[PDB]
Each structure stands twice: as C-alpha cells, then as structure tokens.
Enzyme design. Structure first.
Site: not given
Ligand SMILES: CC(C)CC(CC(C)C)NC(=O)[C@@H]1CNC[C@H](N2CC(=O)N(c3ccccc3Cl)CC2(C)C)C1
Ligand SMILES: *[C@@H]1O[C@H](CO)[C@@H](O)[C@H](O)[C@H]1NC(C)=O
Length: 336
Positions: A38, A222
């Site tokens: 990510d 992203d």
């Molecule tokens: C908004 C940004 C700039 C900051 C924020 C948090 C910060 C502390 C880094 N970053 C994010 O939230 C991340 C932004 N990029 C995506 C990321 N995903 C969220 C998500 O929905 N995921 C997921 C996918 C499929 C199934 C289940 C899950 Cl959990 C996995 C991750 C965590 C990689 C979170």
C-alpha cells in the site's frame, strides 16, 4: 543515497480484481504472510499470535509467533493504524523480513486487535506500506527506506503492475520497472510535496457533457486501494452522469446499460488518462435483470491529505505505475 545493481520483484496474486498480494517472510525460520503493498500508508503489520481469538479475523489468518523466531527483537510500544475503511491495533516488534529476495531487519506491528469487518473480507494477512516515513504512524521507518539503506537497489524507485485476469496476478519491481509490462514512454508528474504519493490533477472528464474538478484537485496514487475514489460531492456528480444508483457502499448500473457508459478521463501532468466502461464496470452480466458494480467508490479523506481523489487498482490495472523517490515524482505508462 547508495545505489547498487540489484532490482527485485515480488510476484503478486490477483484476488477478485480488488486485492493484490504477495508473500513475505518474517523471523527465523521464516513465517510466511500474504500482504498487500500500500502506497497509501507507511507501516508494516501482520496479525499477532497474541491476538485474542475472539477476533474471528485472527482465527482466519496467519498469526506471527515471536516464540518461534530466533531473530525476533522485542520493543512493545503500542500502535494503532486508523485506515479509511477500518482500524487495526497492536504493538511494535522487530525481526528480519524477506521480500522479493531481499532480507531486511524491520520494525513492524503485531496486530492484536483486528475487526471482523472489514478484515474478515481480507484475503491477505497484513499490509506493507510503501509510503514515505512522513505518513508512518509511530514514526517507524518504512521497509523501503530500510532497503534503500542497504545500497543494493539500482534505482531509488519501485513499480507496480496489476494484471486484469483475476497468468501473473501482478508484479512489483523494487529498484526499477519492468518493460515487459508497459509500452510507450513513461510520463511523470511531480508530487505536491515529498512524504505523500499524491499529485496534482488538472481535471476529470466524464464522456463529453460533464467536467468535474475544473479548478484542480488532488490525486493520491494508491496501490492499496481497489477502486478509484473521489469526495462524496465529486462521485455524486460523476455517478449522476453515469446513470448509476447508489447502494449502501458502492454504485451500480443495470448490467445491460454497462457497456454503454461514457469514458472517464483523468488529466494528470498534461496527459489524458482515459478509462472505458470495460475499465471500471464489473461486467459479469448483460441482462437488465441484474446490477453491475462500478469500481469507483466515494470516500472523503480528511486534511491535511484530503479532500482528494484516490487512484487505485482500477486505474493501475490500465497504467503501469512507477514511484520515483529520488525525484519525488510518479510516472505512468500503458500497461500490457
Ligand atoms: C487516507 C490516507 C492518506 C491515510 C490512511 C491511513 C494512514 C494512517 C496511513 N491510509 C489508508 O487508509 C490506506 C489507503 N490505501 C488503501 C489501504 N487499504 C484499505 C483497505 O480497505 N484495505 C482492505 C482492502 C480489501 C479488504 C480489506 C481491507 Cl482492510 C487494505 C488497505 C489498508 C491496504 C488503506
Ligand atoms: C522501541 O524502539 C524505540 C526506537 O525506535 C526505542 O526508543 C524504544 O525504547 C523501543 N522500545 C523498547 C522500550 O524496547
């Protein structure tokens, strides 16, 4: 900055076109985990064996056990990652992490609290943030920074390739890019500022009639996001123009109407990046009696980073993406 000659690659697996993950190994002997890379975050974490089994998500994932690692190094300071779609919590630990052949000592969080929603829906076990240290929670050095400190990578950059077929599922090249998965030339845009993989976006067009972001907007590139997202305000206008109706978490169109949706273009650094309905519609049917989901969500990221659009797999599937840390820019090329 020491540059060597080594470039490494991590083979990714494609899960439903929404989750792209690869294997990493933590501890001695290696305990393998499935993780997503990510660029939207900078921490590394996997579920801990110390995670109460009342968190069903932990019962359904690989748990890191420090008692089986001879390379483990205790620390224990608490850690909480509050992502857009959910939160995880635990403590910091250190051990050797192998990724794409590279062995690096890393500070990662052992999650002891990970909610069923959304993590039960997670094919992966953990996440490897590919963001700058500026976004790292707990002021923890990102795994890429540590790899760069080894002076083995030929370039201070990494590239992502997401395949369409859910063949190779996807591929991350650490230290460069793979010309096998892109054609034409790369076109770069500068980061609004170092510390975040976000770039200026000059405008979003939908078909021929509507024009969103006419005064400019921010675009977070992203790799960890499955879909393309914009402020609720943006997506409402956007979806209005598509004729889609809003459900609780996503938008859908009657599948028969799918193939006729207009193109959507993102103006980035003076280059029109266009997607066709086939690029953002999960065309699983052509009947009017079924609803087809769109790979475009509404999501309001808070300042200082938001409001902003997020370009995820929906976008990266079509455009090979290179993240340049030395020049603080992001380059795009047509994937293949
Ligand atoms: C908004 C940004 C700039 C900051 C924020 C948090 C910060 C502390 C880094 N970053 C994010 O939230 C991340 C932004 N990029 C995506 C990321 N995903 C969220 C998500 O929905 N995921 C997921 C996918 C499929 C199934 C289940 C899950 Cl959990 C996995 C991750 C965590 C990689 C979170
Ligand atoms: C965790 O690491 C930090 C340095 O990053 C250190 O200051 C701290 O003491 C460590 N935690 C402990 C007490 O082991």
């Amino acid at each position: 900055l020491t540059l060597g000659n080594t470039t490494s690659s991590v083979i990714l697996t494609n899960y439903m076109d929404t989750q792209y993950y690869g294997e990493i190994g933590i501890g001695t002997p290696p305990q393998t985990f499935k993780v997503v890379f990510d660029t939207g975050s900078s921490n590394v974490w996997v579920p801990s064996s110390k995670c109460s089994r009342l968190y069903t998500a932990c019962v359904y994932h690989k748990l890191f056990d420090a008692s089986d690692s001879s390379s483990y190094k205790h620390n224990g300071t608490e850690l909480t990652l509050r992502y857009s779609t959910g939160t995880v919590s635990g403590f910091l630990s250190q051990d050797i992490i192998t990724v794409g052949g590279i062995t690096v000592t890393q500070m990662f969080g052992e999650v002891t609290e990970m909610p069923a929603l959304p993590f039960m829906l997670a094919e992966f076990d953990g996440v490897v943030g590919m963001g700058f240290i500026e976004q790292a929670i707990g002021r923890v050095t990102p795994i890429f920074d540590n790899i760069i400190s080894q002076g083995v990578l030929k370039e201070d950059v990494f590239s992502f390739y997401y395949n369409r077929d859910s063949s190779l599922g996807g591929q991350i090249v650490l230290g460069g890019s793979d010309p096998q998965h892109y054609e034409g030339n790369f076109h770069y845009i500068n980061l609004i500022k170092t510390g975040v993989w976000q770039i200026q976006m000059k405008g979003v067009s939908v078909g021929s009639s509507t024009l969103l972001c006419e005064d400019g907007c921010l675009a977070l590139v992203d790799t960890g996001a499955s879909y393309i997202s914009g402020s609720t305000s943006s997506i409402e206008k956007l979806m209005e123009a598509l004729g889609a109706k809003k459900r609780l978490f996503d938008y859908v169109v009657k599948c028969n109407e799918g193939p006729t949706l207009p193109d959507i273009s993102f103006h980035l650094g003076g280059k029109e990046y266009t997607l066709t309905s086939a690029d953002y519609v999960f065309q699983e049917s052509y009947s009017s009696k079924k609803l087809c989901t769109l790979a475009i969500h509404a999501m309001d990221i808070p300042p200082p980073t938001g409001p902003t659009w997020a370009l995820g797999a929906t976008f990266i599937r079509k455009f090979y993406t290179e993240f340049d840390r030395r020049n603080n820019r992001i380059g795009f090329a047509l994937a293949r």
